[PDB]
Design a protein around this motif. Structure first.
Motif: not given
Ligand SMILES: CCCCCCCCCCCCCCCC(=O)O
Ligand SMILES: CCCCCCCCCCCCCCCC(=O)O
Ligand SMILES: [Fe+2]
Ligand SMILES: [Fe+2]
Ligand SMILES: [Fe+2]
Ligand SMILES: [Fe+2]
Ligand SMILES: [Mn+2]
Ligand SMILES: [Mn+2]
Lengths: 286, 286
Positions: B251, B56, B52
């Motif tokens: 995110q 980004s 995750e």
């Protein structure tokens, strides 16, 4: 017209592409800056020459300044055509090609300024044959690419630009200059510039060979086209050579003073050799 | 079409031309080579991120690779138009501009390869507004120059390319990246690349300012045109900013992990500031 997408977003540069490799070599070996050349001795040398020795040098210099300026301007359509075909690696390399030519134009112009002939109009040493090539055929062939990027058009452009102007005329002009003035001990700044120039031009001709060969590899018929376009220009190549040769025989003062046997019949044959050599670098089948 | 003659044969380069001076500075300050950047720590950093945190970073990188690739390709028509107007000094400088952009494209693509996302298609982070600018408006404005090199067309091209794409979006992307990852201690190779890039881009924007101002100096009506073309693109500029901003809020894992308060409401305002600042660099009268 719109970009469909971008190669370095969908994927990456093709790191193994021959033109990417040539681009990498250009960056490594392309650092010279004509602004660093010391021309002070060239100024003294030129001043110490007699009026008649002075002009002896000018025709060749006239051909080179014009030539570098033309190839600076006239590569742009090739970069466009290959960009539009999505050949990103070719384009990357062509940025180095174009910037080299800029330095070449700069170098001769700096020399002219330094020796005190910048105010002189050297166009008087461009005869009809020179004009046919540099004022006409070269820009015609390149500009055609804006509206016609067919294999035939791309081969013709590379032939005129890379094989004839660079690979035959220019290569021979480097040789001739070195032969005359290196032996005399004259114009060290200019010779240094010419050496750096000659190194850059090694890469340029490789691009021309890659481009013509890759098209010829699709279809052997295109080999005949290449040989024919070479032969079509020859008369102008030799017709400019004769005109120079002949000027240089009418003012042989610099030869006799600095006592070097300028064998025009040897330069003439280098030009012949260069031409035939360029033909041999393209094979019907490779 | 034929060359009428050549400036460095009739005379010399205009050594005092602002674009000749910019060209000289480009050669001096343009030596960096993305092939020398050490990306090994960037590889480790990216791998150590969570899935995750990994993504980004990607939208911004997607915008930059696409952006550099587009400006590499899309400067060619400006170089052509100015060449055809006989602006030799501008052309010389533009060889440095084009080669810089080549290095920029190369740098991001090398980073992608090194961290292991080269096989990933990052087009998914180009929303409609991004496409409107980079896939459409930018190439339209530049390609127009092939058939229309009117003052209006040249101002519009420099506005879209130099003032908006480079001077607003890109400048803001450098700031944003530095702000986020310099603070994190991440991606040192990429930041080094971005620093070199930012230095080159200083020269590019000066060319855009010179070009727009010199046209505006002929006729103040063209000032209104410039401001209007700026405003016409703004919605797409901010519409891309919002889309990014919004992805980055969904995110925020990298923010919380590396514990940096990413003030999107501060980046958003830098983009606003950049835009207004570019307007101020053109005067109705100068
Ligand atoms: C007397 C011997 C004749 C030698 C032939 C002289 C040729 C003059 C060269 C002018 C061409 C310069 C073109 C530049 C090509 C490039 O920079 O890629
Ligand atoms: C969240 C803050 C938003 C910041 C804006 C990000 C903009 C991405 C930049 C992509 C443009 C790259 C264009 C290159 C221009 C040039 O190389 O001359
Ligand atoms: Fe060349
Ligand atoms: Fe003749
Ligand atoms: Fe730029
Ligand atoms: Fe929207
Ligand atoms: Mn050259
Ligand atoms: Mn750039």
């Amino acid at each position: 017209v719109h970009h469909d997408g971008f190669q370095t977003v969908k994927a990456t540069i093709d790191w193994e592409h021959p033109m990417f490799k040539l681009y990498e070599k250009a960056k490594r070996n392309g650092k010279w800056n004509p602004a660093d050349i010391d021309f002070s001795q060239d100024q003294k040398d030129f001043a110490s020459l007699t009026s008649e020795e002075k002009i002896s040098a000018l025709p060749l210099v006239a051909g080179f300044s014009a030539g570098e300026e033309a190839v600076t301007l006239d590569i742009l359509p090739m970069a466009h055509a290959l960009a539009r075909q999505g050949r990103l690696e070719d384009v990357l390399f062509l940025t180095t090609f174009m910037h080299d030519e800029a330095k070449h134009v700069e170098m001769f112009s700096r020399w002219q300024q330094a020796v005190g002939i910048g105010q002189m109009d050297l166009s008087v040493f461009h005869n009809d044959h020179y004009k046919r090539i540099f004022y006409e055929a070269l820009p015609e062939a390149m500009n055609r690419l804006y509206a016609d990027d067919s294999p035939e058009a791309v081969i013709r452009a590379a032939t005129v630009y890379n094989m004839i102007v660079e690979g035959t005329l220019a290569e021979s002009g480097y040789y001739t200059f070195r032969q005359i003035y290196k032996k005399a001990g004259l114009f060290p700044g200019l010779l240094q510039g010419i050496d750096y120039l000659n190194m850059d031009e090694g890469r340029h001709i490789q691009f021309g060979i890659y481009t013509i060969q890759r098209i010829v590899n699709e279809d052997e018929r295109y080999y005949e086209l290449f040989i024919r376009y070479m032969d079509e220009l020859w008369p102008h190549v030799i017709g400019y050579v004769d005109y120079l040769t002949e000027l240089g025989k009418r003012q042989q003062q610099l030869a006799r003073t600095y006592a070097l046997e300028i064998d025009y019949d040897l330069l003439r044959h280098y030009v012949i050799k260069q031409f035939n050599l360029r033909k041999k670098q393209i094979s019907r089948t490779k």
